[PDB]
Amino acid sequence: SAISNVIDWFNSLLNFQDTTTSNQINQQNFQIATLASGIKKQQWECRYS
Amino acid sequence: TAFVTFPEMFCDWGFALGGTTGAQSTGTAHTHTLNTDGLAALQIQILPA
């Protein structure tokens, strides 16, 4: 039972590890995309975006 | 939040004229004096069906 519990805890830790890494990558990419895009000049202010 | 072809402040308001006009078409040569009685703003276009 002790080894089985250790197996379960290690699997849970690996799941948390991958979820946290994916969340970090997604958050950083989302912030970079938001910074890259955003407000653009309207048609009357200037011709180009 | 909205988008407009040109700022609504023109559609709501106008500008006061000032200065002096040029030569006339015919008659005694003279130049009229502009004042606040002259309003510069957008026009109205009629349109049939």
Give the whole-angstrom CA distance, residue A42 versus residue A48: 9
The torsion angles phi and psi of B18, rounded to 5 degrees, stand at -165, 155
Cross-chain Cβ contact A44/B3 below 8 Å? no
Q: Which residues from B are below 8 Å from A44, CB to CB?
A: 4-7
- C-alpha distances out from residue B28 to B25, B33, B34, B41, Å: 9, 16, 19, 30
Structure tokens, B34: 């502009």
- Show which of residues 6-25 on chain B sit within 8 Å of chain A, judged by CB atoms: 6-7
- C-alpha distances out from residue B3 to A42, A44, B46, Å: 8, 10, 24
Q: Which residues from B are below 8 Å from A41, CB to CB?
A: none
Distance of CA B37 to the CA centre of its chain: 11
DSSP B32: P
